[PDB]
Structure formats: structure tokens, C-alpha cells
Enzyme design. Structure first.
Site, PDB file in Angstrom:
ATOM      1  N   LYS A  23       0.250   3.883   4.452  1.00  0.00           N
ATOM      2  CA  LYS A  23       0.720   3.939   5.785  1.00  0.00           C
ATOM      3  C   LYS A  23       1.921   4.583   5.991  1.00  0.00           C
ATOM      4  CE  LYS A  23      -1.561  -0.723   6.097  1.00  0.00           C
ATOM      5  NZ  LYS A  23      -2.146  -0.737   4.531  1.00  0.00           N
TER       6      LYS A  23
ATOM      7  N   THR B 233       0.757  -1.366  -0.086  1.00  0.00           N
ATOM      8  CA  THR B 233       0.027  -0.153  -0.074  1.00  0.00           C
ATOM      9  C   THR B 233       0.866   1.122   0.045  1.00  0.00           C
ATOM     10  OG1 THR B 233      -0.040  -0.154   2.406  1.00  0.00           O
ATOM     11  CG2 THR B 233      -2.068  -1.103   1.247  1.00  0.00           C
TER      12      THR B 233
HETATM   13  C1  LIG Z   1      -0.303  -6.718   5.175  1.00  0.00           C
HETATM   14  C2  LIG Z   1      -1.390  -5.664   4.732  1.00  0.00           C
HETATM   15  N1  LIG Z   1      -2.015  -5.651   3.173  1.00  0.00           N
HETATM   16  C3  LIG Z   1      -2.981  -5.135   3.168  1.00  0.00           C
HETATM   17  C4  LIG Z   1      -3.509  -4.075   3.776  1.00  0.00           C
HETATM   18  C5  LIG Z   1      -4.745  -3.063   3.341  1.00  0.00           C
HETATM   19  O1  LIG Z   1      -5.165  -2.779   2.223  1.00  0.00           O
HETATM   20  P1  LIG Z   1      -6.678  -1.884   2.090  1.00  0.00           P
HETATM   21  O2  LIG Z   1      -5.824  -0.641   1.227  1.00  0.00           O
HETATM   22  O3  LIG Z   1      -7.296  -2.665   1.242  1.00  0.00           O
HETATM   23  O4  LIG Z   1      -6.912  -1.675   3.385  1.00  0.00           O
HETATM   24  C6  LIG Z   1      -3.244  -3.889   5.152  1.00  0.00           C
HETATM   25  C7  LIG Z   1      -3.751  -2.847   6.364  1.00  0.00           C
HETATM   26  N2  LIG Z   1      -4.563  -3.658   7.514  1.00  0.00           N
HETATM   27  C8  LIG Z   1      -5.129  -2.794   8.350  1.00  0.00           C
HETATM   28  C9  LIG Z   1      -4.085  -2.105   9.305  1.00  0.00           C
HETATM   29  O5  LIG Z   1      -2.955  -2.661   9.279  1.00  0.00           O
HETATM   30  O6  LIG Z   1      -4.655  -1.305  10.139  1.00  0.00           O
HETATM   31  C10 LIG Z   1      -2.049  -4.663   5.650  1.00  0.00           C
HETATM   32  O7  LIG Z   1      -1.461  -4.684   7.007  1.00  0.00           O
END
Ligand SMILES: Cc1ncc(COP(=O)(O)O)c(CNCC(=O)O)c1O
Ligand SMILES: Cc1[nH]nc2c1[C@](c1cc(F)cc(-c3cccc(CCC(=O)O)c3)c1)(C(C)C)C(C#N)=C(N)O2
Ligand SMILES: Cc1[nH]nc2c1[C@](c1cc(F)cc(-c3cccc(CCC(=O)O)c3)c1)(C(C)C)C(C#N)=C(N)O2
Ligand SMILES: Cc1ncc(COP(=O)(O)O)c(CNCC(=O)O)c1O
Ligand SMILES: [Cl-]
Lengths: 442, 442
Positions: free
Chosen positions: B237, B234
Site C-alpha cells: 500500500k 503489508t
Molecule cells: C488493516 C489491513 N490489514 C490487512 C490488509 C490486507 O492484506 P492482504 O494482503 O491479505 O489483502 C488490508 C487491506 N484491505 C483492503 C483495502 O484496504 O483496500 C488492511 O486494510
């Protein structure tokens, strides 16, 4: 610990392409039937800090907290959606999280039938979408032909949905879903006879209304909410919203569909929603309701009728000889040019349109038409009288395309060699730029 | 024929909720390990008219014309992405179209293994993602457990990835893909030993680096690009971009992977790309390559170590007793409070964090920990010294949670009746608001 310099300073390279993109949009006769121009308010939403927030789940059932204001936005968007499309929050539900139209369709489809599920939709070549089960002898081109077992119905030689064939196919195939609502279909849809065929074999009725959403909402065209189990739509075409999608589900006809559809969107397929999209969608859905927007939508249809009539007056053939909506498909066979050739010619004069199959085309390899639509240009302020000019410009493009093919040949690579520097095109481009450049631009 | 009144005029109801959301973001200690704050430049891109453009396909192989500027933006994004992650465009390719992380993973998985394909990933309860094959006894919760055949590996009782069990499982299961890189894993990953296990069974190595992307980019943690066939991430983050995703593929190791991945994204799964996203991603990827951003990323790790150390100094247990990255998982068993209870208590004081499983949790039903991380607060200017206050606030929140549980009981319904009006929580909230509200805010 961040750089807060504005886009021009922080990234000059990107900012020039973006300024160029904008100038091209402003100076183009945009006849892409699936395109529009968003207002400043919708674009303020899309760049809003609400996209910083992770809010996996649904309102009042979030995984995280700090989602009080996010919950009001998601609930305001759902309310406004059901209001815009004349449905009662008691009988109909809506999911507002799908990121785009294709995602919305795959998710809604999965909810109804699951993996290995049997579906029926219109073939791509006949005006169906990719997410309606499109495959090819060589490949399962869409996931909807692969994660599902799909069968594909066609339009007749005159370009109309052939309901006798839908029924003959449905009774032998026995699918759980029949998809209607299309990408390049110039007429209204008989949802009632779809609802009849679906009952006969016990299948769900799925209406993809992405191209005609505004007509459905404003009661100008037939209403699939009277007959459909599921209604999907994008928010970015005729509806004029951001790039997003909406899945509607009929609670009354199907108790237990609400959870199925909601769980398909998350956690089956998506993660966190994009709250800037949902905000932007809320904002547009308010406009969609207003009587001003019904005026706009009516104007789209008036423009489309006038454009059809002007093209016919210049001896140009249209698939189904007319339109009930915002879109026209031009049959180009009498000029012996392909759609891709005219798309190239039109690109060179800042006319945006796309090549498009017609009934006679067995394949998608050489489409023998182009598709045009009025929503973008209706948004920019064009009225019925301006459609003659657009019809004039397209007729001139067809002639130039015939001249160029004459001079350089039928091979596309050879054809395009004619385009740069062509005196008439530079002339025609300049006429386009001068007219389009002036028009109101959001 | 459009309304161009600014957002406040056109939609006052929505503009209030949005300004409220902004105030809450401003006044919050945000410890969600997956969240960050985008700068103004990235948000200018998200709201740019480039989202008006339909551009299905890839650069120089578009379905439509009028995409000269879109093709430059998309080519600039791919270029800047390969550069940012220190890979040669000769050896590595990248697709920039996936709308989000979950989409990117389902698409990349499909490309590699197809429907009915066999995949291995970390269990959700152990720190894996939903899109790594998560299912339950009761349901195939993720599409990645339904359209694929998945098996799930666990961490050991100390919280580390248990490689002996990963090999044990791989040899009997024989998947075509093994997924590593996680959602709530506090340590670095041994990609080399993953590569060794994948080779032994002829499986692809899939690295999802969404949580640690910046560390990989800036050469602070192990580099999966030396070993992996596919890397997804992504952009929203720790990377600090818009909500989007990137799929990387290793051409050298797998000729013909480029087409399968590209065709998986479109037309198998998606339709039109969201060009505003792609613009925004380009804009951030430029920042990612600067020495200033490596300084930021280093600061994230410094803050995380300092936070881990201060929490240990206050007799709070951490899973794996520390961290190599931006994230910590607190084990709450010694205080006999659940993660959801402390999540509620922290919401009441404008502290944003999430409940999170720990190794002893058999289920995902009552998680015994919370997960925190430093990217958001590091973005807001907080340094190592400021982590003592955050550990101080969390310790006080755990104590109050223990107090409230004593008074009102261990049922969650009962517990929350304790929260509103609590004198110490109002006092603790006000301290949070005073410090957070002052910090730099993009
Ligand atoms: C390993 C991983 N892959 C993909 C995603 C998320 O893709 P989306 O853009 O569809 O949300 C997350 C986020 N997971 C939620 C968190 O860590 O808060 C993640 O931790
Ligand atoms: C690009 C696109 N997306 N959805 C569409 C199209 C349309 C289209 C036109 C066209 F000339 C070709 C395609 C097409 C897109 C993807 C794959 C294929 C398969 C054929 C191949 O691989 O050569 C065809 C799709 C147009 C709206 C642009 C289309 C038609 N005709 C229909 N019905 O729906
Ligand atoms: C919300 C979410 N998305 N991806 C995640 C999560 C995490 C999570 C935490 C949590 F307490 C529960 C879940 C969860 C999400 C969807 C379905 C389920 C199944 C349990 C049920 O149906 O009650 C659990 C998921 C957190 C980062 C928030 C998680 C954990 N622990 C992991 N590993 O990854
Ligand atoms: C019936 C239908 N459904 C879904 C979509 C698209 O969803 P995305 O947001 O995933 O593009 C389209 C647009 N098809 C392209 C066009 O008409 O120009 C469509 O025509
Ligand atoms: Cl967006």
C-alpha cells in the site's frame, strides 16, 4: 514522484547477490524433487503491473470496479486449468487464488470439515506433507493438527502405503477427510481403493498432487479426478509454473462445495489476490496443454527410471527399489552415513538434494536417506544417458562422505570440519560446474 | 527442453489483456486508498529467478543447502525493515516470510493466543479489517472469528474510536489480544491508551499499520512501536512495495515471542517462502529509508488535507470532518445515493474508488460512503493544486449519480442501465483520461 532507475543502479548491493544466486543455479546439479526453472514468459508475468490491482472477491462478483481486465485473466486461468487437467467446466470447479500450496491445503481442508474437523493423512516421516495433519508428541507442528483433529497413517517397512492400515484407522477414527498424494513418495497411488475406504466411512477424498501434477495432466500416471472430491496442487514444481496453488472441487459429487471452497479462500483466509501470480499461472497452463510439454513430462519419467537403474547398478538401495514417477529416495543405511551428511557433501560439490526419512526411521530427527528428482535437470536438457554421470557423481559423494566420517567422526559438527579444502571435493565440484554450467538455462 | 519465446510470442491472448490492463491503469484517477504503483526495480525483483529456490525454515537454520545467497537476501530484508521502522534489532525482531497481509495477521494472532484464543478488534463496518475477528449473525466470515473467539468494538457516531467502550468490552471479555490499526480509519490512533487498557487486563497490544505504515516509518504520525507487542504491516500500500507482509515482535517486553511467531509462520501455516517477494521487499525498504521517500510520504498527507478541504468547500461531508492521514471517507447521505452507485459512476469515468461503510450504517449491505486516498496519485506526481480537479470530478460524479437515479430509479439494476452511453459521463471520462494519461507512470 518515484525513482525509476534500474535495479543495478538503484540497489547495487541486492543486485550482486541476485547475480550470484543466478550463477549458482546455473552451475548446480539441482536434484531437488520439488524445484524447477521457470521460462522468461512466466517471469515477465510475475513482474507485471497487474500486481498493482486490488481485486478482492471473484470474477463478476468483485468488491471494487476497474477489474474488467483482471476478470478476464482470472477466468482465462480457471478455463486453462480445467482444460490442462482433462475435466469439464460443468463437473469440476477450480479456485486460482491460493498464494501457495500450504495455504491451498489449509483452506480446502477448512471448507470440507471446519474447525475441530477430523482428518487423516500420511505421516511426514512416511512421505506426507506438513499440511496433511503433521504433529509430534511435543507439539502440534502444523496448524492442520491444531485447527483440526488429525490422525496419521504410515507406509509399511518396504515404503508402500499400507491400505489395510488406512482402512483399520479410518473405521475407528471416522474422519470427514482422507488426504492422499504426497511429498516424498516414489510410487503411483491407488486412488480407487482410497475412494472405496472414503465411501465406507462417508469421508471426502482429498488428493494433493503437487509433486505429480504433470503426470496426472498428461495421463502418464493414475487420475485422481475419477475418484476425488478435492484435488489440490502447487503450480511451481513439476508443472513448472510460478509459486502458487490450485484447488479443484467436484461439483457433481458435491453440490454446494463451490461456495464452501470459494469462501474459505476469500474471505475466510486471504484478502486480495496476487494477480501477477494468476497471470503467470495462466501463461504456464497454456504450455502444460501443448504436446511439447507431454514430451517434457515423459522425459522426466524416462530420466528418473534411468537414474534409479544406474544407482541400483552401483549397489545403491532405493526405497521401494524403484520409482513410478520423477522422484527417488535413496536408503543410506548400508554406508552408515546420515542424509544430512550427504546433503552437506553434495552442497560442497554444487549438487542440490535434501535429506529425507525412510521407513526404518521412527523419527524425523536423523533421516537415513536423501531424496532426488529429475524435473529441474530434465528442464535443463539432460537425457537418459546423462543420468549415469549423475549416478556416478552421487556414488563418489557417498564414498567421500564415508571417508570424511572415518577421518573426522560421526558427529555432524566434527564431520563438516573435513569439507572445506578437501582436494577430491574441489575436484568433484569442478566436474559438476563444468557439466552443469554448459546446459541450457531458462 | 523449454520454450524461451518472449511473452508476446508464446501467449498473445494473455499479452493483450495485460497491455490493456496497463493502459487502464495509465488512464485512471486511482483513489483506492490501499493501492500504489511499484517502480521498475521492485518489478525486476518479482520476476527474478530467485523464486526457483525452495528454502523452508529460516536463515542459518534452513532444511536445505544451496541457500547461502537466499540467506543473505532474507537477512538484508530483516535488517532493512528494522532500520526503516526505527527499531533496534536488539529490542525488536521481524519475520519477512508472510505471503500477504491477511496471512501475516492470522499467523501473528495464532502465535499469541492459539486456537480458541480470545481477541478484540475493530468491526469491519466501523473500519476494521476482516482479519481483526470479523463475523456476522449468519456466519463466522473470517477465520479469525472461527479459529479464535472474537469480540468487536465500534467507532462512535462521529467516526472516532470509542476508547471507553474498548475498556468496557475488554474488562468483561478479557481477551489475550486487542487489535488496533485499521482499513478505513481517517484519523491517527492513540496507541498509548491502547497499551494502558491492554496492561489492565493482561492482553497483548497488536498494531496493524498496513494503511499508515509510511507515516509511522517516517515519524509523521504516532509510533506504535513505543507501545505495541506486535506490529504487522503489508508492503504494497502506502509503503509502495510488492504484495507481502511483515510481522514485528517486541523481544524486550516478551522473551520467547521470537520463536512462537517464527514457528507460527513456518511450519504452522506456510511452507516455502517466496524469495522473489523477499528480494522485492528488500529493494523497497531501501527506498523507504531515504529522505526522498519521506518527501513522498509528506506529499501524501499534504494531498489528502488539500483534498479533504476542497471536498468540504464543495459542501461534501467527510467522516470525522477531515483526516490525519492518506485517506478520506465521504458520507453520501445528504445526496441520497449509495456508495455502490457512485462506485459504478466513477468506474464509468475511469475513477477508481471503493464503497465504504460510515458510522450510521448498521450493516455492510448498503454502505453510505466511499473511501478515497492519495498514495497512488501522489506517486503519479500530483500536488496540492491538483486536488481541486479531483474534488471537482468527484462532485460532478455525485451530481450525475443523483441525476441518473432520478431518471432510472433507486434500484441498482435499474440505475446502471442509465450509465452506458451517457453524454456527460463520456465527457467526464474523456477529461479524466486526458489528465491521468499524461501523468508520470512507473
Ligand atoms: C488493516 C489491513 N490489514 C490487512 C490488509 C490486507 O492484506 P492482504 O494482503 O491479505 O489483502 C488490508 C487491506 N484491505 C483492503 C483495502 O484496504 O483496500 C488492511 O486494510
Ligand atoms: C522440509 C519439508 N517440508 N515438507 C516435507 C519436508 C521433508 C522434511 C525432511 C526433514 F528431514 C525434516 C522435516 C521437518 C520439517 C519441519 C518440522 C519437522 C519436525 C521435527 C523437528 O522439529 O525437529 C521436520 C521435513 C523433506 C521434503 C525436506 C519431508 C521429509 N522427509 C517431508 N515428508 O515433507
Ligand atoms: C473488501 C474489504 N476488505 N477489508 C475491508 C473491506 C471493506 C468492505 C466494504 C464493503 F462494502 C463490504 C465488505 C465485505 C467484505 C466481505 C464480506 C462482507 C460481509 C457482507 C456480505 O456477505 O454481503 C463485507 C468489505 C472496504 C475497504 C472495501 C471495508 C469496509 N467498509 C473494510 N472495513 O475492510
Ligand atoms: C504434497 C505437498 N503439498 C504442498 C507443498 C508445498 O506448498 P508450499 O508452496 O506452501 O511450499 C509441498 C512441497 N514440499 C516441499 C518439497 O517437496 O520440497 C508438497 O510436497
Ligand atoms: Cl509473487
Amino acid at each position: 514522484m518515484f525513482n525509476n532507475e534500474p535495479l543495478e543502479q538503484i540497489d547495487k548491493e541486492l543486485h550482486d547477490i541476485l547475480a550470484d544466486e543466478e550463477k549458482r543455479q546455473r552451475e548446480t546439479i539441482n536434484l531437488i524433487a520439488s524445484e524447477n526453472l521457470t521460462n522468461g514468459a512466466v517471469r515477465e508475468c510475475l513482474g507485471n503491473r497487474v500486481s498493482n490491482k486490488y481485486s478482492e472477491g471473484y470474477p463478476k462478483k468483485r468488491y471494487y470496479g476497474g477489474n474488467d481486465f483482471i476478470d478476464k485473466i482470472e477466468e482465462l486461468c480457471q478455463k486453462r486449468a480445467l482444460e490442462a487437467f482433462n475435466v469439464s467446466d460443468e463437473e469440476w470447479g477450480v479456485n486460482v487464488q491460493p498464494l501457495s500450496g500450504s495455504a491451498a491445503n489449509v483452506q480446502a481442508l477448512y471448507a470440507l470439515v471446519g474447525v475441530k474437523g477430523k482428518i487423516m493423512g500420511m505421516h511426514l516421516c512416511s512421505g506426507g506433507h506438513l499440511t496433511h495433519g503433521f504433529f509430534d508428541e511435543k507439539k502440534k507442528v502444523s496448524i492442520t493438527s491444531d485447527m483440526f483433529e488429525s490422525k496419521l497413517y504410515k507406509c509399511n517397512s518396504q515404503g508402500y502405503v499400507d491400505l489395510d492400515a488406512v482402512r483399520e484407522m479410518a473405521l475407528s477414527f471416522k474422519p470427514k477427510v482422507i488426504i492422499c498424494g504426497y511429498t516424498s513418495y516414489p510410487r503411483d497411488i491407488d486412488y480407487q481403493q482410497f475412494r472405496q475406504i472414503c465411501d465406507e466411512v462417508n469421508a471426502y477424498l482429498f488428493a494433493d498432487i503437487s509433486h505429480i501434477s504433470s503426470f496426472v495432466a498428461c495421463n502418464i500416471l493414475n487420475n485422481p479426478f475419477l475418484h476425488a472430491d478435492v484435488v489440490t496442487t502447487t503450480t511451481h514444481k513439476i508443472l513448472r509454473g510460478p509459486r502458487s496453488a490450485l484447488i479443484f472441487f467436484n461439483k457433481k459429487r458435491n453440490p454446494g462445495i463451490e461456495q464452501k471452497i470459494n469462501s474459505a479462500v476469500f474471505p475466510s483466509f486471504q484478502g486480495g489476490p496476487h494477480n501477477n501470480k494468476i497471470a503467470a499461472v495462466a501463461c504456464q497452463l497454456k504450455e502444460v496443454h501443448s504436446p511439447a510439454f507431454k514430451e517434457y513430462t515423459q522425459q522426466v519419467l524416462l530420466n528418473s527410471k534411468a537414474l534409479a537403474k544406474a544407482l541400483i547398478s552401483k549397489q545403491i538401495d532405493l526405497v521401494t527399489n524403484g520409482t513410478d514417477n520423477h522422484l527417488i529416495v535413496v536408503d543410506l543405511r548400508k554406508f552408515s552415513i546420515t542424509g544430512s551428511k550427504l546433503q552437506e557433501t553434495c552442497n560442497a560439490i554444487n549438487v542440490s538434494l535434501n535429506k529425507n526419512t525412510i521407513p526404518s526411521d521412527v523419527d524425523c530427527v536423523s533421516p537415513s536417506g536423501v531424496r532426488i528428482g529429475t524435473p529441474a535437470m530434465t528442464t535443463r536438457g539432460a537425457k537418459e544417458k546423462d543420468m549415469e554421470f549423475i549416478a556416478d557423481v552421487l556414488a563418489r559423494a557417498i564414498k567421500i562422505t564415508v571417508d570424511l566420517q572415518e577421518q573426522y567422526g560421526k558427529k555432524l559438527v566434527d564431520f563438516k570440519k573435513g569439507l572445506p579444502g578437501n582436494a577430491q571435493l574441489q575436484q568433484l565440484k569442478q566436474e559438476v560446474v563444468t557439466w552443469a554450467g554448459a546446459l541450457p538455462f531458462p
